Amino acid sequence: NPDPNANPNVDPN
Amino acid sequence: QVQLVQSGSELKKPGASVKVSCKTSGYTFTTYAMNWVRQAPGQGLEWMGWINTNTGNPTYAPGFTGRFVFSFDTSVSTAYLQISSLKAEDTAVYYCARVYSYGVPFDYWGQGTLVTVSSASTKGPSVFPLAPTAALGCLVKDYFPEPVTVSWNSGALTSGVHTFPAVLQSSGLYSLSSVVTVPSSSLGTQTYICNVNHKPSNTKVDKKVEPK
Amino acid sequence: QSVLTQPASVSGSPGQSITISCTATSSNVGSFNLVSWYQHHPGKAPKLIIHEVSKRPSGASNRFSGSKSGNTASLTISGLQAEDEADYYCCSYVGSDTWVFGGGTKLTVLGQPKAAPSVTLFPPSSEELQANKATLVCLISDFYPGAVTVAWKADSSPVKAGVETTTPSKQSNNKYAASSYLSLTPEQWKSHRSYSCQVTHEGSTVEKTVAP
Questions:
Q1: Which residues of C touch A2 (CB under 8 A)?
Q2: B24 touches chain C (CB under 8 A)
Q3: Which CATH architecture has domain B120-212?
Q4: Which of B73, B96, C2, C181 has the most CB atoms in a 10 Å sphere around its CB?
């Protein structure tokens, strides 16, 4: 799974 | 202080549209995703999807595809939920909720927006007496929509009163009862009147309940 | 059919500790370390109380703890208190930037003795009969726990047709109450020798009868 500290609200490009 | 404040209750007919708002404050709006969650009556929370406030892209969960639109307006830091082809089973409380991170989702929630979908139209109640320590009451029948408030003797009678929540009949109309327990010896001396108020129909009824 | 399975209900008495399980039924949770829990009081927004399986945010009491063994995450509440009576939901990331909630668990705090329902049955009022309608009103009050079933009988045969029954709701005195309505034509009402309302509570039954 993703890093818990990461933010899903980002540009994927 | 982070705050998500949603618009007020909605009442819609099947086949109509609805658009709910979620105004935010206390944080940078485009840093964090806005999520939507639905709770139907007597059911759990269901995750509906989210909108990416950096890109604008919405993501819908299966079952909320086809007639649901997530949007936002950055000039007023507000997100929106639009629903088309409304049906009775869309009756639910709709919440917006922020996601801070993968580890911390749904840290702040809006207060919810109730959206009721019914084919019924506004109709005032038909009040009938429930004649009689003796119990007596009033039957408030076949009204729409909620709410109805009931008092006794203009509020001078409070002890031993209970107004039950309403049933939703198959016809889409609501009914409820209010009952008060009183001493048997008071019957024939004290007058008992239920004061029914149905604001949605601009109707009030004062029904005297006497022995029979 | 949520991918996270919670018991429908759990109960405990004040001061005890209780545990709510949340088992993942699919591999889309991956490592199952992005597990969060929410407390939901009626009329209020859900509240984040655990994230990342076991992390407690600021604001949630230290009586709430989260754990995991294998694919079952668990919420434990220590020193149970009356205000803990609420719905609890677990939640997991399930890949591709999607989330899911468990079915929810209703936690009941048994801070009150059991009480059998009091039942009052009202026949159709004269006025209503004169309007060519007829409603039996069965009012149920002062019972705990808040779970009942209602059945109607015309003489001795049961009657499901025309029955509308509310869900129990808290009274002013903290006990529960509910109502049931049987709709009939004036012909049916006068057609039978009597009608009865039968309230079942904790396996025992209280029946009231009315006669035209």
A1: 34, 93
A2: no
A3: Sandwich (2.60)
A4: B96
Query: Please, is B204 exposed, middle or buried when counting C-beta atoms within 10 Å of its C-beta (0-12, 13-18, 19+)?
Result: middle
Q: Evaluate whether C29 touches C94 at the Cβ level (below 8 Å).
A: yes
Answer whether A1 sits within 8 Å of C30, measured CB to CB.
yes
Instruction: Report whether C190 contacts C212 (CB < 8 A).
Output: yes
Distance CA B194, CA C123 (A): 18
Same domain, C85 and C17: yes
Q: Nominal resolution in Å?
A: 1.8
Which helix (H) or strand (E) covers residue B177, if one does?
Answer: strand B174-182
State how far the Cα of B211 lies from the Cα of C136, in Å rounded to an integer: 18
For chain C, the helix, strand and coil percentages under 3-state DSSP, each to the nearest 5:
10, 50, 40
**Beta-ladder partners of C181:** C137, C164
Q: What residues form DSSP beta bridges with B193?
A: B208
- DSSP assigned state of C130: H
The method recorded for this entry reads X-ray
Sequence-distant (6+) residues with CB within 8 A of B65 are none
**Domain edge (last residue) among C59, C90, C111:** C111
B15: tokens are 């086949």
Per-window interface: A 1-13 vs C, CB < 8 A: 1-2, 4, 8
